[PDB]
């Protein structure tokens, strides 16, 4: 699948011979102030190989100038957090998905 | 955009979209380009919602 997920975080191969298990958990890990512990990677240099975890705290360069320790004007931090609040409806609740 | 970041250091570039380098990797067809001048004390409230 093409999108924010399954293209930079966890891409699944064409053949898999298995499936996922998903259920609603809006009280075990969802808090009124927003559970910021869960976060995703937004920006990557290229695509992701199937079944390949990638962890990196480095900044992804997004311009001509090479961003080494400066970010905000040209380059972004690749990690963005989740605003997991119970005040939303059903399209933004944290779903506990295990494959 | 190569010729974009040679116009003095900026003030604020927080974004909720795509990277400038993948703007080169993804070819577009329509972008809005509008500008205005505001006092510096009244730029911080320019945000969605």
């Amino acid at each position, epitope marked *: 699948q093409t999108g924010n997920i399954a293209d930079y975080n966890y891409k699944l191969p064409d053949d898999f011979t298995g499936c996922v298990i998903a259920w609603n958990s809006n009280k075990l890990d969802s808090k*009124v*102030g927003g559970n910021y512990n869960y*976060l995703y990677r937004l920006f990557r240099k290229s695509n992701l190989k199937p079944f390949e975890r990638d962890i990196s705290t480095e900044i992804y360069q997004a311009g001509n100038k090479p961003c080494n320790g*400066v970010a*905000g004007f040209n380059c972004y931090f690749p990690l963005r957090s989740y605003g997991f609040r119970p005040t939303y409806g059903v399209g933004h609740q944290p779903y506990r998905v295990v494959v | 955009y190569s010729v974009l970041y040679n116009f003095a250091p900026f003030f604020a570039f*927080k974004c909720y979209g795509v990277s400038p380098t993948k703007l080169n990797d993804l070819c577009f067809t329509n972008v809005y380009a509008d500008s205005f001048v505001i006092r510096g004390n009244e730029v911080s409230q320019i945000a969605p919602g």
Partner: antibody, heavy 126, light 109 residues
């Protein structure tokens, strides 16, 4: 919400001092707490954060072995103590509650101290 | 480590004065900057969060941001509440914790 805490008084050096913070109004199961110190005429200092619903803890790179942790969920309080107090430790302590919830190392970026607790100046001398 | 700030900065009322907050490679620039003010003999409170916005109860008068490896704060109008001190705060990875500033004192002329 209101963040009353009970201070201490002058004490002999090298003893143990007990200071606690009280949580009222908001539910004390979803918000991390933060403890800071303020010497007179000196900037604030960070030590660590304590989760209310878990026994997770973390300490700074300078204050590791001289600080412990105690939780009281039924009383709905937090308990902290200082061991081997120093002469240059007469600093006011603030019970600061951070918005959101974090337990990982990298979650500290999006955290700001929303509300603060009033503190009492505790100086250790005999 | 610590953040280098001027010990004091003063200006006449009716105009705008600026406060600088320098930082290292890991202290600021790769992270977000927050500012705290404290009344004398009271508790500190939040001033600017997420580098641009302000919480409820704080008017549009307060203003602060960052450009490179340094941050700047600007105020406009010193009548009764801008005589307090200000602090510059950020996060780094060397100390694995919050590193705060030294302290900036603002008076009136």
């Amino acid at each position: 919400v209101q963040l009353v805490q009970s201070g201490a008084e002058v004490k002999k050096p090298g003893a143990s001092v007990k200071v606690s913070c009280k949580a009222s109004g908001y539910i004390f199961s979803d918000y991390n707490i933060h403890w800071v110190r303020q010497a007179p005429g000196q900037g604030l200092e960070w030590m660590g954060w304590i989760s209310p619903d878990s026994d997770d803890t973390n300490y700074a790179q300078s204050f590791q072995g001289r600080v412990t942790m105690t939780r009281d969920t039924s009383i709905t309080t937090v308990y902290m103590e200082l061991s081997s107090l120093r002469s240059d430790d007469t600093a006011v302590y603030f019970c600061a509650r951070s918005v959101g919830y974090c337990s990982l190392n990298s979650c500290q970026r999006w955290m700001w101290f929303d509300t603060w607790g009033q503190g009492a100046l505790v100086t250790v001398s005999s | 480590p610590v953040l280098t700030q001027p010990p004091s900065a003063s200006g006449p009322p009716g105009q705008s004065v600026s406060i600088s907050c320098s930082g290292s490679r890991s202290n600021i620039g790769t992270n977000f900057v927050y500012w705290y003010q404290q009344l004398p003999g009271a508790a500190p409170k939040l001033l600017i969060y997420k580098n641009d916005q302000r919480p409820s109860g704080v008017p549009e008068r307060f203003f602060g941001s960052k450009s490179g490896t340094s941050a700047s704060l600007a105020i406009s109008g010193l009548r009764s509440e801008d005589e307090v001190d200000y602090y510059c705060a950020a996060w780094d990875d060397s100390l694995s914790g919050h590193v705060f500033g030294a302290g900036t004192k603002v008076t009136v002329l």
